[PDB]
């Protein structure tokens, strides 16, 4: 998988030379977004899809929130270089042009766009039943960040404060594991802690644009990480310094998954475990950062960056990543 | 499909207000690219996939050129608003992380990027065997066009000259019809004019960046159209005026399709029929435009813009669209 993707990554890096010294000259690949040089500012560009969450949407017949998921997966990544999201295009590859599905998808696209402050400006619709067994929804978003205001993680230093913003639930990663582990055994109508299994699996991804844009315009921020594939391992994309953290108690769908045989260390590498976005700020800014974020969503002081390198210590679970 | 898509298009237009008076304010949806206002210039944004051509690549086990198709589909669209292509991201949704397929895909991605002059700056790889029966490749491209230099088609006038640039072959539209009509009847190893059927169906899409950028910097240009889905109907996106055209002889794979019973009026709405890109220039510029374009590829004087509003007359075939 990494082996396969490395072939494309290598080729993409070779193509950087084609814009060397020209408008659009890129930074490196591998971060939450690509940065393209437009002189006084960078354009930030990112691409992501919903994933197999859309199979749960199709199973129950509820498509009016997967547009929120797709917008969230893109605009939340733009935030992680310090960019203001501006615009998005969607790529909708479908087995058939079902009018009711499209109507529902459009509802969630509007709600997500309004929350993120972005215009949906175009896209592609491909009807290909020979290739697509469902309704696959992906997109590409662009944002803007002033030169000198990019937030890469390079400024993260030992001692910095690490703050987590609560997720809304499972978001859009780990659904293949959750689907296969739980649906055949329990049924989509199984009730767990007051919600049906499909409600746990379909709850739309949280959009962090409003709290994060307020944060970065108020306090010094050293790193921003959207918690997606790889779970807490995404922190290692920002820095090689270590982390010492306390994570929230395991609740909801995450507890059901854990009780069905997924060990905790694997959980923290797959699921967001209740924290959808992590910010790293100088310890001098910690109280104000917590104050700002908490006005939008439940937020937690998780811990600190350490001089110890490359380790993520989840102290209250006794787990090291 | 149109009634399904209408729901998403209506929502998209509703989100335009979210950037009203701000950086990134968009133009209207429906053209070959979205235009976003960045002050002195517009960013142009387009999204497109290869389509079921990838099933022919998978059938024969050759993905070495599908990346060219995806880059061409996107950069050729950017040209139609007058934009210089800058950068692209790819969306690769796959049934399995096949290292051989990915290495092959990477080869054509590099070749296409170099011919178009774009950097591949990022993307998304989604391994989703329950959702994808093959290797679906799409992407999003961005380009730049100066204010006052956008080519929308609004300048097209009756009497303007219409020039076609030859296609390389089938390009990336009509493959569903061609696959289902020809492959079971003839076999992928069927030889027609010295090429196997799979060679006809897999021939990579032509990239028009170099001829068109030279053209728009040399002569007055009123309209530019990449001949994709809908075939000649794409001309109607540029203008409400009519067209009087003579199309080239029906050759190669298009002749084989025609000889298997598809009517010509449908074929001119599905296939490019030998013309992959059409330019509309004032009559006074016709000879210079032909000289510039013909340096790069075989090009044709097709005909003229007329006052027969909304009609495309292919006079040498007796067809009206
Ligand atoms: N098919 C691809 N082509 C080019 N770059 C890719 C592709 N898939 C992933 N990438 C790059 O790899 C990095 C990680 O991607 P991904 O695993 O989707 O995580 P994220 O969405 O958090 O960046 C990103 O910088 C992305 O642009
Ligand atoms: N899923 C979608 N979301 C938003 N806009 C779309 C979508 N599908 C198509 N469009 C818009 O409709 C127009 C026609 O698109 P398409 O049929 O792909 O033709 P082309 O690729 O030649 O533009 C384009 O402006 C495109 O941006």
């Amino acid at each position: 998988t990494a082996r396969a993707l490395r072939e494309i990554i290598r080729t993409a890096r070779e193509t950087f030379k084609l814009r060397k010294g020209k408008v659009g000259e890129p930074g490196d690949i591998g971060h939450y977004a690509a940065l393209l040089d437009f002189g006084n500012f960078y354009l930030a560009m990112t691409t992501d899809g919903v994933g197999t969450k859309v199979l749960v949407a199709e199973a129950v017949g509820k498509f009016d929130t997967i547009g929120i998921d797709m917008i969230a997966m893109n605009v939340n990544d733009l935030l992680c270089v310090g960019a203001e999201p501006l615009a998005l295009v969607d790529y909708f590859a479908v087995k058939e042009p079902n009018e009711e599905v499209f109507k529902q998808v459009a509802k969630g696209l509007y709600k997500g766009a309004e929350e993120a402050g972005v215009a949906i400006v175009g896209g592609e619709t491909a009807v290909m039943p020979d290739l697509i067994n469902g309704y696959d929804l992906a997109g590409t978003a662009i944002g803007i960040v002033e030169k000198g205001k990019v937030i890469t993680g390079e400024r993260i230093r030992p001692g910095d404060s690490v703050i987590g913003i609560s997720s809304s639930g499972i978001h859009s990663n780990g659904l293949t594991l959750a689907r296969k582990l739980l649906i055949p055994k329990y049924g989509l109508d199984y009730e767990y802690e007051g919600r049906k299994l499909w409600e746990w699996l379909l709850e739309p991804t949280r959009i962090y644009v409003r709290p994060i844009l307020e944060l970065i315009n108020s306090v010094e921020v050293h790193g921003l990480a959207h918690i997606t594939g790889g779970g807490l391992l995404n922190l290692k994309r920002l820095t090689n310094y270590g982390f010492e953290l306390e994570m929230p108690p395991i609740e909801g769908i995450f507890k059901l998954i854990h009780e069905n045989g997924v060990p905790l260390d694997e959980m923290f590498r797959v699921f967001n475990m209740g924290v959808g976005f992590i910010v790293v700020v100088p310890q001098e800014e910690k109280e104000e950062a917590l104050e700002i974020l908490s006005r939008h969503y439940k937020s937690y002081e998780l811990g600190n960056v350490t001089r110890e390198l490359g380790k993520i210590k989840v102290k209250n679970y006794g787990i090291t990543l």
Side-chain angles (χ1 to χ4, degrees), chain A residues 63-134:
Chain A
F63 291 90
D64 47 14
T65 59
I66 59 163
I68 299 165
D69 293 306
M70 172 280 278
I71 290 165
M73 295 291 108
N74 282 286
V75 304
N76 287 346
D77 279 4
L78 288 180
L79 297 173
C80 296
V81 298
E84 176 196 1
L86 306 173
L88 180 142
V89 292
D90 65 294
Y91 175 56
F92 197 29
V94 303
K95 51 152 78 163
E96 75 196 13
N98 190 298
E99 190 187 339
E100 175 70 32
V101 172
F102 277 59
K103 170 192 205 239
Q104 283 184 47
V105 166
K107 295 190 208 293
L109 286 175
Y110 181 81
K111 290 181 168 203
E114 186 179 64
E115 183 53 41
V118 300
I120 301 169
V121 301
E124 172 66 32
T125 309
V127 181
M128 324 182 274
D130 293 323
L131 260 179
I132 311 293
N133 293 141

Side-chain angles (χ1 to χ4, degrees), chain A residues 5 8-9 12 29-33 46-48 77 226 228 234 237:
Chain A
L5 176 46
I8 297 178
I9 304 281
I29 202 163
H31 202 289
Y32 282 99
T46 193
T47 309
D48 219 314
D77 279 4
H226 181 207
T228 51
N234 283 287
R237 304 165 72 176

Side-chain angles (χ1 to χ4, degrees), chain A residues 6-38:
Chain A
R6 276 329 188 122
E7 304 278 11
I8 297 178
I9 304 281
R10 248 65 200 181
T11 278
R13 277 217 190 100
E14 283 316 302
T15 71
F16 292 175
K17 91 188 110 161
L18 304 168
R19 301 311 301 177
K20 184 285 217 293
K22 317 175 178 196
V23 56
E25 184 190 284
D28 198 24
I29 202 163
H31 202 289
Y32 282 99
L35 290 169
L36 309 188
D37 198 330
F38 279 73

Side-chain angles (χ1 to χ4, degrees), chain A residues 244-248 275 300-303 313-317:
Chain A
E244 220 177 75
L245 313 174
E246 286 187 353
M247 283 294 279
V275 180
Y300 317 101
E301 179 181 1
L302 298 180
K313 289 174 195 352
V314 186
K315 291 162 5 196
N316 60 330
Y317 283 88

